[PDB]
Amino acid sequence: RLPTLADNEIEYEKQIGKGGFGLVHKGRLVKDKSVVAIKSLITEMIEKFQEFQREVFIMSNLNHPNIVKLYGLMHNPPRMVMEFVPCGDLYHRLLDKAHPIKWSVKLRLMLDIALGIEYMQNQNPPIVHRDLRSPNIFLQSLDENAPVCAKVADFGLSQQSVHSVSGLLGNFQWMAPETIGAEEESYTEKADTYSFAMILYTILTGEGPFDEYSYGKIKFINMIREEGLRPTIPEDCPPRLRNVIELCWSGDPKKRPHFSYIVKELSEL
Ligand SMILES: Cc1cncc2cccc(S(=O)(=O)N3CCCNC[C@@H]3C)c12
Numbered sequence: 039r040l041p042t043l044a045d046n047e048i049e050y051e052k053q054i055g056k057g058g059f060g061l062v063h064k065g066r067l068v069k070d071k072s073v074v075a076i077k078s079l080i081t082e083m084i085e086k087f088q089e090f091q092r093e094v095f096i097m098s099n100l101n102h103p104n105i106v107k108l109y110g111l112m113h114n115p116p117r118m119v120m121e122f123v124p125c126g127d128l129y130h131r132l133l134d135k136a137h138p139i140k141w142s143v144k145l146r147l148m149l150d151i152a153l154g155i156e157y158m159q160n161q162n163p164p165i166v167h168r169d170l171r172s173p174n175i176f177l178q179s180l181d182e183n184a185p186v187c188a189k190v191a192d193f194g195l196s197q198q199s200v201h202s203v204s205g206l207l208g209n210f211q212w213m214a215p216e217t218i219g220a221e222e223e224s225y226t227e228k229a230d231t232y233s234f235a236m237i238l239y240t241i242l243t244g245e246g247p248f249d250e251y252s253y254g255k256i257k258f259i260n261m262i263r264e265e266g267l268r269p270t271i272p273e274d275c276p277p278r279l280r281n282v283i284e285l286c287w288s289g290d291p292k293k294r295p296h297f298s299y300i301v302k303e304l305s306e307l
């Protein structure tokens with residue numbers, strides 16, 4: 039099911055953050071002493087309750103090593119109890135320029151994320167995250183021999199059944215073109231595939247996607263949609279990686295590949 043643990047089973051330790059519908063806490067699980075993260079819930083915008091519920095539904099149906107696991111629920115207030123991932127997030131790690139990630143570790147990271155997404159796309163119906171970017175990838179370990187190096191986190195914006203329209207304004211540098219300016223079949227799983235190409239770009243270069251450019255917001259969106267504007271892949275990138283990224287970021291969603299092709303090409307690098 040989704041199990042309920044309320045208060046006796048859990049012990050709090052600190053506070054590790056704020057951000058979305060409440061307060062996040064570090065804590066631990068008293069029965070076997072696993073360490074966990076605890077997400078709490080704090081009119082018309084008081085329907086972020088709907089957000090909390092949606093995150094629950096999606097998580098309860100996922101069970102994979104490269105996806106953050108939901109342990110249980112707690113009541114009064116409403117809380118989510120999830121595994122705690124020790125080494126921070128990908129976006130912050132890439133910001134340390136003095137200590138670049140080594141090439142073999144970079145490959146693990148790329149593959150580990152691709153496995154997580156492949157699993158999501160194989161569900162019926164397919165699960166779409168909708169907010170994939172570097173701050174949403176959490177790091178379990180940076181040892182090249184660890185069983186797991188990276189995990190997909192924060193299903194704050196996602197859905198089932200391949201449909202949804204344009205919604206809420208976004209950091210457009212990570213999103214597929216059919217999702218930004220409005221469209222109709224927009225938000226299939228193919229949109230996540232475009233976001234994955236940006237994650238590959240960032241891991242490869244250590245840089246933000248589209249940071250080479252400066253445009254006003256309307257102009258930038260039009261360049262990406264109509265002119266095919268993309269980040270520049272460096273000359274020394276291996277050709278096999280260059281191909282995977284270019285296919286993944288195609289303007290036509292139908293040309294973005296299946297994750298079975300993607301995992302195979304990455305394993306050959
Ligand atoms: C959304 C949801 C979706 N799927 C399974 C669930 C199992 C238990 C509780 C919920 S839940 O509604 O999200 N939820 C928050 C409070 C509402 N009722 C009980 C529980 C505390 C589920």
Ligand SMILES: Cc1cncc2cccc(S(=O)(=O)N3CCCNC[C@@H]3C)c12
Pocket residue numbers: 054055056057058062075077120121122123124176191192
């Ligand atoms: C789930 C989780 C799991 N493990 C470690 C964590 C460390 C910091 C923040 C979180 S976290 O709360 O999930 N989280 C995501 C929501 C945005 N604000 C808080 C931070 C980004 C962790």
